[PDB]
Amino acid sequence: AMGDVSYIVDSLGLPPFSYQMSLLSFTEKGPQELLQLLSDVFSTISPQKVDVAKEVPDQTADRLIGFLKIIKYRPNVQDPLLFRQLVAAGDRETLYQILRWVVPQAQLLEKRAFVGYYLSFPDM
Protein backbone atom coordinates (compact mmCIF):
# COMPACT_ATOMS: atom_id res chain seq x y z
CA ALA A 1 0.00 0.00 0.00
CA MET A 2 0.86 3.74 -0.22
CA GLY A 3 1.96 4.70 3.31
CA ASP A 4 4.45 1.86 2.86
CA VAL A 5 5.77 3.20 -0.43
CA SER A 6 6.41 6.68 1.02
CA TYR A 7 7.98 5.12 4.11
CA ILE A 8 10.40 2.96 2.05
CA VAL A 9 11.13 5.86 -0.26
CA ASP A 10 11.78 8.35 2.57
CA SER A 11 14.09 5.81 4.23
CA LEU A 12 16.11 5.32 1.02
CA GLY A 13 16.70 9.08 1.07
CA LEU A 14 18.49 8.74 4.42
CA PRO A 15 21.80 7.06 5.30
CA PRO A 16 23.15 4.49 4.53
CA PHE A 17 21.51 4.98 1.10
CA SER A 18 21.09 8.76 0.67
CA TYR A 19 19.41 8.15 -2.67
CA GLN A 20 16.48 10.14 -4.09
CA MET A 21 13.84 7.88 -5.56
CA SER A 22 10.56 9.35 -6.80
CA LEU A 23 7.34 7.85 -5.47
CA LEU A 24 6.56 6.82 -9.04
CA SER A 25 9.97 5.31 -9.96
CA PHE A 26 9.52 3.06 -6.94
CA THR A 27 5.97 1.97 -7.83
CA GLU A 28 7.02 1.38 -11.45
CA LYS A 29 9.37 -1.46 -10.45
CA GLY A 30 8.31 -4.99 -11.39
CA PRO A 31 9.23 -8.21 -9.54
CA GLN A 32 12.79 -8.39 -10.80
CA GLU A 33 13.51 -4.73 -10.08
CA LEU A 34 12.20 -5.32 -6.52
CA LEU A 35 14.35 -8.42 -5.85
CA GLN A 36 17.34 -6.45 -7.14
CA LEU A 37 16.41 -3.60 -4.78
CA LEU A 38 16.22 -5.96 -1.79
CA SER A 39 19.51 -7.46 -2.88
CA ASP A 40 21.09 -3.99 -3.03
CA VAL A 41 19.62 -3.00 0.34
CA PHE A 42 21.29 -6.08 1.87
CA SER A 43 24.57 -5.32 0.07
CA THR A 44 24.52 -1.75 1.41
CA ILE A 45 24.03 -3.08 4.98
CA SER A 46 26.67 -5.89 5.27
CA PRO A 47 30.13 -4.83 3.94
CA GLN A 48 28.35 -8.66 -2.06
CA LYS A 49 26.93 -6.66 -4.97
CA VAL A 50 24.79 -9.10 -6.96
CA ASP A 51 23.03 -8.84 -10.28
CA VAL A 52 19.86 -10.85 -9.83
CA ALA A 53 19.76 -11.47 -13.62
CA LYS A 54 22.84 -13.66 -13.19
CA GLU A 55 20.75 -15.70 -10.76
CA VAL A 56 17.62 -17.77 -11.18
CA PRO A 57 14.83 -16.27 -9.03
CA ASP A 58 14.78 -19.35 -6.75
CA GLN A 59 18.40 -18.96 -5.58
CA THR A 60 17.88 -15.21 -5.37
CA ALA A 61 15.00 -16.07 -3.05
CA ASP A 62 17.05 -18.53 -1.04
CA ARG A 63 19.92 -16.03 -0.79
CA LEU A 64 17.68 -13.18 0.46
CA ILE A 65 15.62 -15.47 2.69
CA GLY A 66 18.93 -16.53 4.25
CA PHE A 67 19.79 -12.90 5.05
CA LEU A 68 16.33 -12.26 6.52
CA LYS A 69 16.43 -15.23 8.88
CA ILE A 70 19.67 -13.97 10.35
CA ILE A 71 17.99 -10.67 11.23
CA LYS A 72 14.80 -12.38 12.44
CA TYR A 73 12.20 -11.39 9.85
CA ARG A 74 8.74 -12.71 10.70
CA PRO A 75 6.93 -12.99 7.34
CA ASN A 76 3.20 -12.30 7.21
CA VAL A 77 2.75 -15.57 5.33
CA GLN A 78 3.38 -18.27 7.93
CA ASP A 79 4.13 -20.94 5.35
CA PRO A 80 7.93 -20.96 4.71
CA LEU A 81 7.46 -22.41 1.22
CA LEU A 82 4.65 -20.00 0.31
CA PHE A 83 7.03 -17.24 1.34
CA ARG A 84 9.91 -18.80 -0.61
CA GLN A 85 7.73 -18.87 -3.77
CA LEU A 86 6.29 -15.40 -3.19
CA VAL A 87 9.82 -14.00 -2.79
CA ALA A 88 10.94 -15.91 -5.91
CA ALA A 89 8.15 -14.49 -8.09
CA GLY A 90 8.94 -11.10 -6.58
CA ASP A 91 5.35 -10.73 -5.42
CA ARG A 92 4.67 -7.01 -4.93
CA GLU A 93 2.87 -7.10 -1.54
CA THR A 94 5.46 -9.50 -0.08
CA LEU A 95 8.34 -7.35 -1.29
CA TYR A 96 6.79 -4.11 -0.03
CA GLN A 97 6.40 -5.88 3.30
CA ILE A 98 10.06 -6.88 3.52
CA LEU A 99 11.32 -3.50 2.31
CA ARG A 100 9.04 -1.67 4.74
CA TRP A 101 10.35 -3.81 7.60
CA VAL A 102 14.00 -3.89 6.46
CA VAL A 103 14.70 -0.46 4.94
CA PRO A 104 13.90 1.53 8.06
CA GLN A 105 16.58 0.26 10.50
CA ALA A 106 19.22 -0.13 7.75
CA GLN A 107 21.24 2.42 9.69
CA LEU A 108 21.00 0.25 12.79
CA LEU A 109 21.64 -2.95 10.76
CA GLU A 110 24.68 -1.53 8.97
CA LYS A 111 26.22 -0.42 12.28
CA ARG A 112 25.87 -3.90 13.75
CA ALA A 113 27.21 -5.64 10.64
CA PHE A 114 30.18 -3.19 10.41
CA VAL A 115 31.10 -4.11 13.96
CA GLY A 116 34.44 -5.85 14.42
CA TYR A 117 34.98 -5.84 10.64
CA TYR A 118 37.95 -3.45 10.51
CA LEU A 119 41.18 -3.93 12.43
CA SER A 120 41.15 -0.24 13.38
CA PHE A 121 37.68 -0.58 14.98
CA PRO A 122 37.62 -3.69 17.22
CA ASP A 123 34.54 -4.94 18.95
CA MET A 124 36.46 -4.23 22.16
What are the residues binding Ta ion (CB under 5 A)?
A: 16, 47
The amino acid present at 107, given as its one-letter code, is: Q
Min dist. Cβ of residue 18 to Ta ion (A): 9
Least distance (Å) between residue 47 CB and Ta ion: 4
CB nearer to Ta ion: give 23 or 108: 108
Q: Which of 86, 82, 106 is nearest to 31 (CA)?
A: 86
Pick between residue 16 and residue 57 the one whose CB is nearest to Ta ion: 16
Q: What is the distance between the alpha carbons of residues 110 and 34, in angstroms, rounded to a whole number?
A: 20
Half-sphere exposure of 79 (CA within 13 A, CB side): 4
Quick one: 16 or 104, whose CB is closer to Ta ion? Answer: 16
User: Shortest distance, CB of residue 91 to Ta ion, whole angstroms?
Assistant: 29
Count of residues for the chain? 124
